Amino acid sequence: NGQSGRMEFFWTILKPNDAINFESNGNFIAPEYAYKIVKKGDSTIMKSELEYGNCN
Amino acid sequence: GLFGAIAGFIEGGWQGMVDGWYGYHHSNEQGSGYAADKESTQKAIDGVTNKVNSIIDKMNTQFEAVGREFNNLERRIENLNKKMEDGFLDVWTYNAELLVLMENERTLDFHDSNVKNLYDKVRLQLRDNAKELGNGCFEFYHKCDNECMESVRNGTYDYPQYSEEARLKREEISSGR
Numbered sequence: 001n002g003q004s005g006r007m008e009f010f011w012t013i014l015k016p017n018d019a020i021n022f023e024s025n026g027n028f029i030a031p032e033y034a035y036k037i038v039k040k041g042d043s044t045i046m047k048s049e050l051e052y053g054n055c056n
Numbered sequence: 057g058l059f060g061a062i063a064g065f066i067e068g069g070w071q072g073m074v075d076g077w078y079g080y081h082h083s084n085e086q087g088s089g090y091a092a093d094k095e096s097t098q099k100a101i102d103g104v105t106n107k108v109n110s111i112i113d114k115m116n117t118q119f120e121a122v123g124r125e126f127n128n129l130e131r132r133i134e135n136l137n138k139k140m141e142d143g144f145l146d147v148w149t150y151n152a153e154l155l156v157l158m159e160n161e162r163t164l165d166f167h168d169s170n171v172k173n174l175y176d177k178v179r180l181q182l183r184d185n186a187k188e189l190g191n192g193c194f195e196f197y198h199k200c201d202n203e204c205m206e207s208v209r210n211g212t213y214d215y216p217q218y219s220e221e222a223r224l225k226r227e228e229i230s231s232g233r
């Protein structure tokens with residue numbers, strides 16, 4: 001996509017009541033938004049080329 | 057068939073007995089007619105119904121594939137995952153197919169048995185008060201009206217009550233007329 005540089009992303013699950021401490025000096029791509037895991041349950045990542053069928 | 061009754065000594069079945077799987081055809085002075093045997097047909101429905109339920113139930117737990125992704129240097133575990141999951145679809149397909157084939161034979165042979173046993177039920181009620189004709193039918197040595205017929209159909213035939221008339225007829229037949 002026209003770029004010879006690279007971006008490498010990382011992640012963690014930060015438990016309630018815990019903190020994440022960054023320190024940097026260059027090349028940091030900082031978080032702005034993060035995701036609360038509001039509900040857990042059965043799901044899956046289906047691989048399909050199809051689209052929403054307005055059905056149940 | 058294993059029991060030699062359906063498409064055996066009884067050659068072909070009755071389009072005209074509609075209210076059961078096994079039953080009777082009778083013929084006497086007052087006419088003729090078909091009548092299902094309720095009790096045998098019911099045992100059969102019970103059997104087959106239970107069978108279909110047992111199959112559904114035993115196939116209830118059974119392997120359920122789940123998708124997992126792997127990167128370009130996890131090819132050995134991606135292959136081990138594919139093969140594991142294909143391995144179970146194969147075990148389970150064999151199990152379903154083979155259960156179906158094996159139980160179909162038993163079912164078809166079950167009905168065959170059921171007709172043989174019903175034939176034998178009538179045979180051992182009547183004994184020498186009737187003559188086995190060989191095609192699935194009995195010819196009585198005595199007059200058997202609709203009340204007498206029902207007694208055959210429902211387990212109640214009184215052999216002693218007709219045996220005298222029976223011995224007189226057998227006597228006439230051996231003597232030549």
Ligand SMILES: *[C@@H]1O[C@H](CO)[C@@H](O[C@@H]2O[C@H](CO)[C@@H](O)[C@H](O)[C@H]2NC(C)=O)[C@H](O)[C@H]1NC(C)=O
Pocket residue numbers: 017018019
């Ligand atoms: C994140 O913030 C909370 C305060 O808002 C901290 O809560 C204290 O944490 C200690 C040690 O974990 C607990 O035993 C106390 O219940 C809390 N103290 C007070 C005065 O509320 C928490 O420690 C912070 N987490 C980190 C990793 O620094």
Ligand SMILES: *[C@@H]1O[C@H](CO)[C@@H](O)[C@H](O)[C@H]1NC(C)=O
Pocket residue numbers: 202203204206207210212
């Ligand atoms: C069986 O057949 C006879 C008819 O000859 C009838 O009178 C009798 O009540 C029947 N028995 C039963 C239990 O249905």
